[PDB]
Design a protein around this ligand. Structure first.
Ligand SMILES: CC(=O)N1CCN(c2cccc(-c3cc(-c4ccnn4C4CCOCC4)c4c(N)ncnn34)c2)CC1
Length: 887
């Protein structure tokens, strides 16, 4: 069709690859994913056309609301007896004359009441409307209490006056095109009865351009199901074997997520050359048989073991790589994994069998359950085990213990991860019973459920339960917050079509705020040939059904492409020139017709609520930094821009990997949020940062900020205190000292916990109002490979806290500061599992300082998790005492 070819061109531009390349893939899993995923697209469209135009408007402008209507105690204390002053703006006559109406209303007033009160005040000056945030495209389209909107909750917590704009419903509705989605043209046995041991034949290898052998292993996630089996040491000039390998496992005992993990190794001096993993079952539940070829992957930097089970599963798309040929066993017919009915029957047969076991029969195994023998000691031991962090070692005795008491475990549902790690995944009698307990398992918090999606949990039944917990209890706010982790754990799915991908895609196509960041996280990794087919196909499905937003995403993609091209020219053809010569070249290139239009009139990828109007060339700069970052400035075309910011500014940087910074910034926001609900107000600055491609992204501009260096220059340790004292003269002096010490306490604790790169005067920034914050988070955890203190409070910082006192280490102000630090540290300690899990979910991402569970072990040290709460406080204090050489 003409409309189809036009749409296919648009999708190609968005993903950065032509749709016709997907058509060419002869792999029934790829073509089935394309067809089958389309029902998620249909479902999402139906939900968006349910209550038109309002439900279309709710998709485009979802309420940016907090997870709970309940406001914290210290926040309410900022309100005039639970009441808020809000300003409502009405544009009257086509002259664009702005009229304001100041209202004093209850914090929990619904937008409809707020509107009625604004029209009363407008009428006293003598339902067909919606409220909009002044200066940006944020709307209050739903019946939430006003204080539940993040914008209002923020204005309350910052002692800022909210500015809302009354707008006719039909003015917004008319600006929402009806997007009628079209279905693309591509939309149109045996079982457990295999009485045999596992044997896989390794035939030969091609493209082996260097004696050598092939190492093999049967894995369930990163765990061996039997002993590893090596081939003979044949010479590399003739890599042939035709040798069958025998495994210590019965074919009916292979779990659903079992994989063959292999590598070509070179011999006392063992070293892996190329590696590759294969699923023993395909996406149809079929056990793989006969001849098959696998293109291997390059050994990653710092890979000690001969195998890579935690590595990507599938053939390398690059076919000019070592290609191992192998052959799997063939039986009577095609073998399939048994269905739930067969599994449920087997578990019930096993359960009933065990229930009739004599005292002495149960005595034969420590894994054997003893009915009505569960004492309160056993019950307390189980509770103690369940409160341990996810990285705590579960001993073999504890594993036998947990499994024998799996029926009591149902009563403490948060023990599910520990109990799942205690199962003998190579025992079908155990796994069948694990399934039936998972099928009826009480639901757990989405934060506990997220862990079950990491690399330690490959089983589909387990991942399905976790997805079900996200579907019932994960709010759109929390989904937005953990989207990066959720997108990463997709790479851990055995197959293209799964329940996690279906849930994410449904939410992306049902909420444009989610859809926006979902698109960008996927797109940013499209250069990675390990994920580009998975992420490309998911992008294609998203682009066919997101509606009008594809056209807006294309404006964003083109703008970024131009900025990448421009900065690639400045770095490779203007690198040695002066800033003046580079600026002249830049302003002449951005003025060109092949650039001017592509760089203005689009939505900010950092926050699509921000419209980027005309580019203000005279305000744009090439920043002094090494990677020649662009400080870009555009006019905000909003009618009421003057109430937020008249010019939207962003930093574009081409050269640095921004992925560790996004993770740290995300963790800073989560820490601040925990502290804020806990009652202790330590203001943090998790500025926006979005990786849009390979070492390329955006950084949010922080207005009225200066490095510690800039201050100390325009010496003495009282310079910083005097600068702040001068910037905040009069009664406002104390509010600035309180904000400095509070933000300072937050960063001391956050940076100590996370092991961030060493702090200096050009790494630390201060706002005019006293808010201190850190920049450049490219280094974290055990990156110095014994625990560091990256943020050392010098005399300058302590002199500010102690209000200019000489003996700042011995003041009331410093004792108050220390208490903020201990309270902050103990609050994070209480939420350790969350942080541990956020980090564990990012292990598959190629982050250089997050490669294994030993890198995450660093926060187990900084949070003194094996210790008691008081010994942990004493530990933190010693770390602070040692670094500062004082106390
Ligand atoms: C007005 C103007 O154009 N100016 C004055 C302010 N200048 C200035 C001076 C010192 C620091 C800065 C500076 C550095 C950073 C920052 C935070 C995280 N990363 N980075 C940058 C990103 C690019 O690569 C380097 C690190 C930021 C920021 N977010 N907002 C405002 N200023 N700012 C900015 C830059 C030039």
């Amino acid at each position: 069709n003409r409309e189809e070819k036009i749409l296919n061109r648009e999708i190609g531009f968005a993903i950065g690859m032509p749709v016709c390349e997907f058509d060419m893939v002869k792999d029934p899993e790829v073509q089935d994913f394309r067809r089958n995923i389309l029902n998620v697209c249909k479902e999402a469209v139906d939900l968006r056309d349910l209550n038109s135009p309002h439900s279309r408007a709710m998709y485009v402008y979802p309420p940016n609301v907090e997870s709970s209507p309940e406001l914290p105690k210290h926040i309410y204390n900022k309100l005039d007896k639970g009441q808020i002053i809000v300003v409502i703006w009405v544009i009257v006559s086509p002259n664009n004359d702005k009229q304001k109406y100041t209202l004093k209303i209850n914090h929990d007033c619904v937008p409809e009441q707020v509107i009625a009160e604004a029209i009363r005040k407008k009428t006293r000056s003598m339902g067909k409307y919606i409220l909009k945030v002044c200066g940006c495209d944020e709307y209050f389209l739903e019946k939430y209490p006003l204080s539940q909107y993040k914008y209002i909750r923020s204005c309350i917590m910052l002692g800022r006056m909210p500015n809302l704009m009354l707008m006719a419903k039909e003015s917004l509705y008319s600006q929402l095109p009806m997007d009628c989605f079209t279905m693309p043209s591509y939309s149109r046995k045996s079982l457990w009865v295999i009485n045999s041991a596992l044997r896989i034949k390794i035939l030969c290898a091609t493209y082996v351009n260097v004696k050598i052998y092939v190492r093999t292993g049967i894995y369930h996630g990163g765990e061996p199901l039997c002993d590893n089996v090596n081939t003979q040491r044949v010479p590399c000039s003739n890599p042939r074997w035709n040798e069958w390998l025998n495994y210590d496992i019965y074919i009916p005992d292979l779990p659903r997520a079992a994989r063959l993990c292999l590598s070509i190794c070179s011999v006392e001096e063992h070293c892996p050359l190329a590696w590759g993993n294969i699923n023993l079952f395909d996406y149809t539940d079929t056990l793989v048989s006969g001849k098959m070829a696998l293109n291997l992957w390059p050994v990653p930097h710092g890979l000690e073991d001969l195998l890579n089970p935690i590595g990507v599963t599938g053939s390398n798309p690059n076919k000019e790589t070592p290609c191992l040929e192998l052959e799997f066993d063939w039986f009577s017919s095609v073998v399939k994994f048994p269905d739930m009915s067969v599994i449920e029957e087997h578990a019930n047969w096993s359960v009933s069998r065990e229930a009739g076991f004599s005292y002495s029969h149960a005595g034969l195994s420590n894994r054997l359950a003893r009915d009505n023998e569960l004492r309160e000691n056993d019950k307390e031991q189980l509770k103690a085990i369940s409160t341990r962090d996810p990285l705590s070692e579960i001993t073999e005795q504890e594993k036998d213990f947990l499994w024998s008491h799996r029926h009591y475990c149902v009563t403490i549902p948060e023990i599910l991860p520990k109990l799942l790690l205690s199962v003998k995944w190579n025992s079908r009698d155990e796994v069948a019973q694990m399934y039936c307990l998972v099928k009826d398992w009480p639901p757990i918090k989405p934060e506990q459920a997220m862990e079950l999606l990491d690399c330690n949990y490959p089983d589909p039944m387990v991942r399905g339960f976790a997805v079900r917990c996200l579907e019932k209890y994960l709010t759109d706010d929390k989904l937005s917050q953990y989207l990066i982790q959720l997108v990463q754990v997709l790479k851990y799915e055995q197959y293209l079509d799964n329940l996690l991908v279906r849930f994410l895609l449904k939410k992306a196509l049902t909420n444009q705020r989610i859809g926006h960041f979902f698109f960008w996280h996927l797109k940013s990794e499209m250069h990675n040939k390990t994920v580009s087919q998975r992420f490309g196909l998911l992008l294609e499905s998203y682009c066919r059904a997101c509606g009008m937003y594809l056209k807006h995403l294309n404006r964003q993609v083109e703008a970024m492409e131009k900025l990448i091209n421009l900065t690639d020219i400045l770095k490779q053809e203007k690198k040695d020139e002066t800033q003046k010569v580079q600026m002249k070249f830049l302003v002449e290139q951005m003025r060109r017709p092949d650039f001017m239009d592509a760089l203005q009139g689009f939505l900010s990828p950092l926050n699509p609520a921000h419209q980027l109007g005309n580019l203000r060339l005279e305000e744009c700069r090439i920043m002094s930094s090494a990677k020649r970052p662009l400080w870009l400035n555009w006019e905000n075309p909003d009618i009421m821009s003057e109430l937020l910011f008249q010019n939207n500014e962003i930093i574009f940087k081409n050269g640095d990997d921004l992925r560790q910074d996004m993770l740290t910034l995300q963790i800073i926001r989560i820490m601040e949020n925990i502290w804020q609900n806990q009652g202790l107000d330590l203001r943090m600055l998790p500025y926006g940062c979005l990786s849009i491609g390979d070492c390329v992204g955006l950084i949010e501009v922080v207005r009225n900020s200066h490095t510690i260096m800039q201050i100390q220059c325009k010496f003495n340790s009282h310079t910083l205190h005097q600068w702040l004292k001068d910037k905040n003269k009069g009664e406002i002096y104390d509010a600035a000292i309180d904000l400095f010490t509070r933000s300072c306490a937050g960063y001391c604790v956050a940076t100590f916990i996370l092991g961030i790169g060493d702090r200096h005067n050009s790494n630390i920034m201060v706002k005019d109002d006293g808010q201190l914050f850190h920049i450049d988070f490219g280094h974290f955890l055990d990156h110095k490979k014994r625990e560091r203190v990256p943020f050392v409070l010098t005399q300058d910082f302590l002199i500010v806290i102690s209000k200019g006192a000489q003996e700042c280490t011995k003041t009331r102000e410093f004792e108050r500061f220390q208490e903020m630090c201990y309270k902050a540290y103990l609050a994070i300690r209480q939420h350790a599992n969350l942080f541990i899990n956020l980090f564990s979910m990012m292990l598959g991402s190629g982050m250089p300082e997050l490669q294994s569970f030993d890198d995450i072990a660093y926060i187990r040290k900084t949070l003194a998790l094996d210790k008691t709460e008081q010994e942990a406080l004493e530990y933190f204090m010693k770390q602070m005492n040692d670094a500062h050489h004082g106390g």
